[model samples]
Target chain A: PFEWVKQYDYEDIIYETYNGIAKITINRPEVHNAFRPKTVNEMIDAFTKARDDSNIGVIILTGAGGKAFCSGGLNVLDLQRLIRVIPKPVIAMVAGYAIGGGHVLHVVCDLTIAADNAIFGQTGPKVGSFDGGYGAGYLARIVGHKKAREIWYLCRQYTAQEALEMGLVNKVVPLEQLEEETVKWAQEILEKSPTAIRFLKAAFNADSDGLAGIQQLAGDATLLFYTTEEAKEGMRAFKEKRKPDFSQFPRFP
Target chain B: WVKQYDYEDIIYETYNGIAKITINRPEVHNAFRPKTVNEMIDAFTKARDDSNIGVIILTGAGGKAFCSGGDPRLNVLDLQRLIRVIPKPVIAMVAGYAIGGGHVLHVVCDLTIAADNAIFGQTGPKVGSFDGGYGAGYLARIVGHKKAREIWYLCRQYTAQEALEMGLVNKVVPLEQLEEETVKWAQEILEKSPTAIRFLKAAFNADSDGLAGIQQLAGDATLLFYTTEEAKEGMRAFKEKRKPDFSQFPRFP
Candidate 1:
């Protein structure tokens, strides 16, 4: 009965914006919320829109129904890559089954909050599908090497409690309270300084991302540098056809 | 325990398949200077090369501190890199402080077992030093980007229990049980297949360490390949003055 303001129209997903949070839901519960090519593309669009929007500070990804989150798909990899590079904070709200690609989706998010009944697992090898990229490597980074390998190799199911203990999900709550808890978390994060949160997200991603990670952190530095008078001087001088004086800025040791 | 080596700043001992390397400057809270790091490198290299040693335990000489970090005028980055690349599993048996570079030291190891009073933190921003390569990025990989960023940016210390909760350390035991627990873990590891353990370690590091990580894993694969009949045909064929025949080997899917 709760109707949040709809911001985007999509066939396989629901995109809604309320307060300062943007919610993206996989709406294919009929097939246990399994994703196809279009589903991922739509999700990408919703994510990009949320990222570019000035009012939305946090993004929450979840399934539409209580029975299933998503099964798996090739396009899930693209979604993972996009989530990592997104400037805003994203949290995965797991209410039921987060199988295969769905599990990796939460793993890639900045934070994962699972409902008490939520189940998680990987079904890659069993179905002739595998995510060797972030699904394997990033998963190892989150849960240790042994556990990550065990999860992928065995393709076993894990409860929300087990996921929390393994460091897969940040927190777990009753299934009925999932949305309320997720919204509470988003609101709390919304209260913090946006710049601090933005840099913090990049700083964390930069660690595992190597040169790409460093590039993201460095880009943030350049953004800040552009705000200074020194940067403005160069821009102004270029437009005015005059040589800029860099000597005016103090080079602090 | 037999003393395998001795130096000005560290102690090394081996018993059965376990090698214990200790930083001996307890008077300065077991902090490592340039000399200490060099000695540690020698001991670690020796442990790595000796086939008799399967597991390594790294700890401080005194009960007061596992390590306070590196001494001023000395760089501990090399030491940190070496520990990460070591072929054998290294466990950091921590008690008391594991601050700054010290925290980075334990984080780089294959596993960490902390004492009840163990303290973990990063002092890079506060102390004017940082290990962006492994220390910062790897930390983010383990603890997720948010918590990892918080630890680095805020420069706050966490207790052993808190560290365990944050996935910084593998497990925590009472102060008196640190060595006993570490020895138990090492013995458990020694009981397992060394080849399997070796490959697993490399595979784990491969995900986060980038090209260098892949190199380590590929090197292990080559090591295994060398033991096969397929690889031997190439070497034997040249010696026997005949062309190598690899047609018998099935390319299994």
Candidate 2:
């Protein structure tokens, strides 16, 4: 049994932590778990807490409504940025209606675990609103251009099976097993070296995110370098206002 | 449509808007020598510069194998990057074994049209070599981290169907209709707007291609901007020795 160690008090979201996992659930069931002013604010804090929590290796994002995950989508922007910029892996536990901005949220997530009954789509064109950035560009990177176009230009809904075929979601399971499957995946990620997974995610972002992505990956390299004596030599030299030794570090390919 | 007999180690031909590059050494299971890769770069560059060519198909001659990898071998990275950065789409038509670095070729292509008999996997450590670049980073972006890890670590081969399931390849067709189906796909792409296709391709690369990807995408943006009257005014004003009129363009909402 997975014991819940803590639950932060927030009206629009539920944030819980246990076993190196931070699970954030959108609690606006009355609106199909769509984002509200409060929901966005609460999610930003939830994501911040999870990112800063050293014991957390993975994050699970979903909603309280059985028939919907998140309907509208940011902080709703910062929230998505937070998910991407955070080093920990985030698994979107989706059960239903991952539509419009909702779909982009899961798209930005590291992995999406969809329930059998889950529905995915974009409502931007129909609603006279659109997500232009990762919502369109990165989506093509995942599902390829043809499908990405059909989803955006046609504004159609796709079943979990279709989403899996398009590579929009990672795995599909019976709705009853959604959380269990998610937990299993989270535990597997937790068992691996978090640093390895973190670097892998950063490496991934480095390619897709452009220069910002390069900074992310370079940042990870610097973080690792900070532990080396080579880095230490430069740091010590700077602090002492003197030239660093030149012959200490070995060259490598 | 013309056939170019100028290359050794590879055959380059064009029919309509489709440029096809085939590794003619099926006897070696289409294993690539450095020469094969160099010839590929030339052929692909030709295809890229040709205004009429909108799509490219890459394959190995003979149905027994698409490619078996390096011929006791190795500069294939240049070939891989060309396949990726080309503004138009490149589809790998895999008929048989796509092993070792051969697997990396398809990985870098915009899409893979696999014949039912196609087999895909990496064999680096077993073959006394490894590709930590596209083989590791790009594959994880396409197939996700766990699967990429399993592929390079377990070093097992997967059938066309399994590859489809893992999102390792885009589509699987029986060996008999591989070319027919792949051409049909290319024709469909040819029907779309070339500029849209170009931007879409660069947009996909921008996610994980890092600064280079940004350059490709931004370069495309500049290409489009150069076609605009707004850009023309700046050039016209400088040549005419007049102050530029700035009130004409609307900032789109």
Candidate 3:
């Protein structure tokens, strides 16, 4: 139902576009797409292009192969924070093995669409070790305390059904329909007012992301202000070297 | 160490690293009075103080209902706040009606396991009283703004399945197996790393809970610090009347 526009040909990731959507795929499925420092670098570059593209309204983040979604990390915070701070919505398209750091990658995304075969969990080495910050924290917000504690402490894999029940992912579909459903969701979001979506995402983050979350909302507010005649008057007044008519805007209740 | 504590408004019991705090006002469909909330507060404090207890289950006395909201109290606000601040996980095991303030109680809980017969909604606007605290904000956080809005405004009832789909509850089981499932979930949490579970809950709270949340998270950090030799050195040096050598700790990246 859509045509893909070729963009970058990076070795570790595939960056593409369709209509108003940006799709970034992790290409290394040999070890279930476990990411390395090199993978993180490529992702930053790809995500930077998406962020800079004025036409891109949404982003799809997923592993390239059907066998697995990307896993692990070098400095994952670089990507995780990117997902959170990026104005556009990110949807994780999952199909197998979202575990440990991989599981966390999806969690950091704004939304997730999981294939039936998709598995979710956390782990460290052969045994479970926990150095997780928001990987466990934001997770508790998504799945609640019992399920969140059960997931991290038990260090067990959860099916897509379980994830949906626990609110880990937005929706679950057959593996074949995973990408299709994700695109549909991305398109649906793209149809809305981009600023409205941006404000909501930032407002949502403000509830749980600390003061930094508030700053995002404020930054978006500033972005909106830049387009207003009131703001234009301030700049225009400075250019003309005269007093500004700042009383034109009425106070809102 | 199975032990039971008797209360006029609630039943508190502990066994197998878990605690069950049951509202005993079965005749009222488990609607909490001012006394009921205070008793609940007492029981929750006891459960929190009990070192062996890892998980807590909050439920009603009879099979006909989990809770019927307030009977009615503005004092229940403390109970809601306590649920968030409690270091351990709380599970609301709902068997029947969980409406009005009762539903908010469940919402305040970390996880909710609902029985097939369980019903959920809000009654604040129905009779005119309202909650703008966790009942309002946190409810939106869990179920999203739309659902939360319909709930508080319309005061419509929801079946267990509807509640499950709304992400209002974690899992729903047959009424007969409610306790069994609840126990099973508690056991799963009990076996996991205690500290890992501890930090996860604290971190989850820190985001939405604001300054209070930061206090809890920082408290956990200090508590964990006390367990290390770095903190122990300060104590040992104070006892020995000397400055402690603090050069042994490595700050890992």
Candidate 4:
């Protein structure tokens, strides 16, 4: 048995890490894993911790029970931003229903790996509460306008196969193979350059977030620049109260 | 066919309510330069201004190539932005290659219809250039961050079916039937309510466009409001130089 480290404690979710992967699971199953305020807050905390922890390179988000992923949707604005702004790669592991706010959670995640029996969709218009934010626009981005409209307007359920076809989820495996496949993906991602992944994440978010997106990508560039000898000269010059010379740095053609 | 304005770099034609804009430089695999983007923007503007045109189809000329992107010096990014804010649905009819900037062109369109021989990918990093704007950010919106990053970083080519499966393209037909299928889609869009379609387009863009998106949607709302008696009263009161009886209008809950 693998020795998993318990990273955080919460009533509504289980946060654990082992090797290079962090797993955050929604513990609620009685109401099909629907989220209330406390559930969302706990999730936010768990994700925030995972994001800060350097040992964790990939995160797997899923529900606790085998029957449902999540149903309730509330206070998602903060959570969505947290997931998007997090530099690490996040994968949603959907074992059951991912409906309404629950659907938005996975949509905000970087990638989604669905179980064979998983059901995916939005219940927004029918629930009298609509996202009108990333949930709507991002969904249109991933699935195209036609399918995105059908999901929101009709509020229908989609099988894992259909979800995979729509590009809403990256992969669909039998429930028994879900964890195995997800971990395999995580390991593959972990083996890649972390800086490349970080910059790519920021670059991907840059378009939708506008200046914020630019800021993130630029920040990564600045981080890379900071490692250069030219940047070090500037930093040292400021500390020593001297004019820094940039002439030595080749203005790369 | 009315035989509208002529262009050196592109072919612009209108049939029924659909306008087709094709990049005509197949010698370079339809790769665009600054001149091509200007011609394209001009054609798009003409189509947008023409009330007769309800939908637009953007594609490449030769059967062997859709577009392989540009030399990177061309301001294709401007073309991408223009497609997003266009007041009507714009579909990309892809055949053969849609690589680098060309790949971004299809991603920016409201929808994309691909030929069976179509190929899709981003070659920015490999080409010593990158479109950090919508090319990266907006692409992430459509394909999710993970896949978007992979496309830019790896610069691998995907088939038409793969593009469709990834939600990068809407429908895939035989290369011979590209135009027929594209026109059929245009006709279906033309049959929808113009006002609804316009607002929906704006609403979909509103999420990623930020304030500009909201402004576009809000402008539509203002246009609708102006047609109402309540708004007309304000205008009439100004012309007559009298205080309008504003109390008559109910403060709608």
Candidate 5:
């Protein structure tokens, strides 16, 4: 067997430029844009590029093909991998089927632009996987704390328009124009003085950070859980081709 | 010696790095009328421009009042004057009743210290008069929007504890400790890097119309004062230094 590997032909992400914006699209629509462990790594790498590159001021993250932005995490292994990665000012353009971890992706973005047909839910309780604190702090931030609790305790699905009114998505555009509108909005902000935008975003984010403290907590917790028994059991079950039996979890009461 | 601007019955004083403007009439409980509001605007302009003065403290002469909000006998023109004026951080150490215009003055200040005996409420609507935009912006910023709305609409008198919990009073002490606390806090602020403090306070208060979610409400609740009738009477009453009669106007709905 040959020792060398051909990497150029095995790319799972789509990176492109149009006008003044850089975009990172999840390019595996055959799986309904499902993210594998490799793909999660790629997303982390992509965001690192988007954040570091001065040429690209904004990033639009979307799924390719029909009415599916992301199927959320691909089984258990990818779920934990995703939780540990992907950092940047991501704008999610969700058209439909943003259920499960897909909803998590939607809320994690700096801004979200959704199509009216989009359907969202946690589906974690039903699936027995668990929500990884992805959309935790948004309750008090977007909607009031009281409303946030209703969704957290009793998992609920919200339409795109409902999310907009609740202050989740900044805008709700038609599916056909989703890509175009997101690019337009991103470019409008990108054209402003980059220095001001960088510092302003950092400074403005400081206030939200001061209140929520979620982003700060994420940096450490994500790494710790990655190497734990729960993570191992969660990932190992997928490899063995069976449902994750987290019911036998250790020291987790 | 410092220059002074005298109007109808308002006495303005400036000296020693601080501009002290006192509502001179005690008989009317130092109620704010249109004339008094205009005098304040004039005095603040001079204080802000002067390089020698680093701070401005606005209180009243009579021990019983710190300029109660608008006079009950104010006209539409008087209401307009109250809406437009009020500048800088005008401190109001309310020793007695700060019901109408009195409430406005205390809340408008960037920081307020209150005596235990001070009675606070926006009782203008009870007199058939509207409030102004200053309360709209200041009330929500100082306390919170929901709480601010509670006082503005319900027109209920709150104790010092309620005010403190709502962030209305920066500090609350016995009537004897009021002056000491205000002086201590002001001096504490003054001792910091002046340029940095100026920039930091401006930055902190920048676009801060009750955006402090942990302490206040989110969104820019600007100019809550301009929309109500009570603000007019408050200002007018302060100018006239008369006890406002709220017999005609009912509590806001």
Candidate 6:
């Protein structure tokens, strides 16, 4: 319905959803459907609508042309800004080029379903900017911090099999059935109870490994520096572009 | 009166009608040493038969870990024998690394409380051992086979956030508040009908896909443990906190 429509304008995107399943389509074809900032905002809007709409349970972010899931971002500069939104249970169906921004897009999703022809990598070191920005948290959580750093630093282009081994993609399929297979996967999730999905997502985020206690540690870390005079000196020195004179401050606990 | 015995295996302490079993051996990162295992099983059995004990709190000795895994010093039969039996609703108050054996202990418990410092993994595969025979199936049921394999095959480590995301633990608290949080949880659980709790634990385990097949495999596993040199290495390394030396053990591809 038009209820999801907002003030945003998108040149190469389409959004459609039904029965708890929402789909975001990238419509650009000439440039192989490169993602733009406008497209990112629309994607966010689409996912927000998916979460808010009772009929929508899972959001699928896909491309229309099928030539490529995406070819990274529209801008040649500031590559890291491509990952503008993140939502739970987001599925990226990549048929081709999921390189650079495209790869980051796939990584942002909870799961990635790739077509056989799908190619994934940062490939950005060849250019100028870094491969991914905020994607590190997710990358480390999925594949471990060491592997994530290795891949990002190395800027290696991994095959689907390598990605699978690295815990990057959930499933890889032939190009012929990429869309169908991705839909099938999303449908299986839709069959499940919405409460289960929402709660599971929350549980995954909140209590996974029972790390909620770490929230306290985060708070404690702030207080540790707050109560130390050396912290004040460090702040002043940081502003003045010189090392802090901490000759006499209480040692660490 | 529900009698409690303090032992070296687990630091069993009883007060306020609660029997607390703390895994005491720190040299092995609290891996399930034979003494610890025997005592834990005995304590649980005794608690089940006791009318005075209201709840059981299971924890590890060192702040560095919960039970790490099977003591790597024991014979195979002993390790296998340990897994086939246990009684009562054990609430695992997990604080630190619950990697291999620690993970199994956490799974068997009716409830789990984790601190953010908790990190989880089955490092056994890296050194050439499947976690435990039953661990594969048990891991599958708890977090799904695909994810189970993802962790098992990859030999990956999981932060508390990753573990929580995968449904590995129930609650996460701060390291400083772990004990308090656990007490709060135990107290909350204690409010439920004691009779119901007992019956519920039994029924749930009975119906659980992992535990349901116990009788069929328990005896076989026990026999395998009795004769396997690798099992001996498992226990020996478990107790030493060093890599298992399989130089004298049979090699398995």
Question: Compared with the true structure, what per-residue lDDT tens digits does model 1 show for residues B61-112?
Answer: 8786899997734446677767777788999999999987888899999899
Instruction: Tell how far residue A26 is off in model 4, in angstroms.
Output: 21
Q: In model 2, which runs have C-alpha deviations exceeding 4 angstroms?
A: B1-133, B136-159, B165-167, B170-253
Tally clashing residue pairs in candidate 1: 1
- Give the better candidate number (1 or 3) by TM-score: 3
| Model 6 C-alpha lDDT per residue in residues A178-208, reported as the tens digit of each score | 8778777676666554432333333233222
Error of 3 at B66 (Å): 2.4
For model 4, what is the error of residue A64's alpha carbon versus the real structure, in angstroms, after optimal superposition?
23
**Could you say which candidate leads in DockQ?**
3
**Per-residue lDDT value at B205 in model 5:** 51
Per-residue C-alpha lDDT of model 4 across residues B1-253, encoded as one tens digit per residue:
4557889989999999989898999899999888988999999999989999999989998896778887524556667777877789999999899998898888889999899999998776555566666777777777765467656655678999888766678899999899898888899999999889989999999977779899999999999999988999999999999999888788877
Taking all chains together, each candidate's TM-score versus the true structure is 0.62, 0.62, 0.77, 0.62, 0.43, 0.43
**Model 3 lDDT, full chain set:** 0.84
**Between 3 and 5, whose TM-score is larger?**
3
Off by over 4 Å in 3: A1-30, A36-42, A45-60, A71-74, A87-91, A110-113, A121-253, B70-75, B126-128, B237-245
| Candidate 6, CAPRI quality class derived from DockQ | incorrect
Q: How well docked is model 6, in DockQ terms?
A: 0.03
Q: How do these models rank on TM-score, best leading?
A: 3, 2, 4, 1, 6, 5
Report per-candidate DockQ: 0.12, 0.08, 0.21, 0.16, 0.02, 0.03
Query: What is the alpha-carbon RMSD of candidate 4 to the true structure?
Result: 8.0
lDDT agreement of model 6 with the native: 0.63
lDDT score at residue A193, model 3, on the 0-100 scale: 93
Name model 6 segments beyond 4 Å from true: A1-9, A74-88, A131-133, A207-253, B1-253
Candidate 2, residues A93-158: lDDT per residue as tens digits? 998889888888888888889999999999998988898888887787777778888899999899
lDDT of 1 by residue, A54-101 (tens): 999889999999877776666667788789888777888998889888
lDDT of 4 by residue, A1-253 (tens): 3466877679988899979889988988988888889988998999888888888888888898887888856466899888888888888889989998889888888888899999988887787888888888778777778888899899999999998876778788999888888888777777666676677778778766678877888988998999999999999999999999999888631
Quantify all predictions' global Cα lDDT against the true fold. 0.84, 0.84, 0.84, 0.84, 0.59, 0.63
lDDT of 4 at B64: 65
